[PDB]
Amino acid sequence: LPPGWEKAMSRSSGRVYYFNHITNASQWERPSEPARVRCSHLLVKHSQSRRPSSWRQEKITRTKEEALELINGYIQKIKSGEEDFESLASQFSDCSSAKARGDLGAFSRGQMQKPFEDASFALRTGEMSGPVFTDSGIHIILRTE
Q: How far apart are CA 62 and CA 73, in angstroms?
A: 15
SS3 120: helix
Q: Whose CA is closest to 117, among 18, 30, 37, 15?
A: 37
For the chain, report the end-to-end CA distance as a whole number of angstroms. 21
Class of residue 42 by CB neighbours under 10 A (exposed 0-12, middle 13-18, buried 19+): buried
Catalytic residues: 41, 95, 113, 136, 139
Q: Whose CA is closest to 31, among 50, 8, 48?
A: 8
Q: Which helix (H) or strand (E) holds 116?
A: helix 114-122
Q: Which amino acid is at 44?
A: V
Fold of 36-145: Chitinase A; domain 3 (3.10.50)
| 83: CB partners within 8 A, 6+ apart | 74, 77
What technique solved it?
X-ray
Q: Are 61 and 71 in contact (CB under 8 A)?
A: no
* Beta strands at 137-143 and 132-134: parallel, antiparallel or unpaired: antiparallel
Q: Which amino acid is at 134?
A: T
Residue 121 CB neighbours (<10 A): 22
Range 26-32 contact pairs with CB under 8 angstroms and sequence separation of 24 or more: 26/130, 31/1, 31/2, 31/5, 32/2
CA dist 25 to 14, 28, 83, 97, 111, Å?
19, 11, 18, 25, 22
Q: How many residues make up the chain in this entry?
A: 145
List, in sequence order, every residue forming a beta bridge with 106; answer none if it has no partner.
38
Q: Are 31 and 5 in contact (CB under 8 A)?
A: yes
Domain limits, CATH 3.10.50.40, in the chain = 36-145
- CATH tag, 1-31: 2.20.70.10
SS3 7: strand
The per-residue DSSP string of 14-75 comes to --EEEEETTT--EESSPP---SEEEEEEEEE--TTSSS--BTTBSS----HHHHHHHHHHHH
List, in sequence order, every residue forming a beta bridge with 42; answer none if it has no partner.
140
CA dist 136 to 5, 16, 75, Å?
26, 33, 19
Q: Are 139 and 70 in contact (CB under 8 A)?
A: no
Crossing angle for the helix pair 85-92 and 64-80, to the nearest 10 degrees: 150
Domain limits, CATH 2.20.70.10, in the chain = 1-31
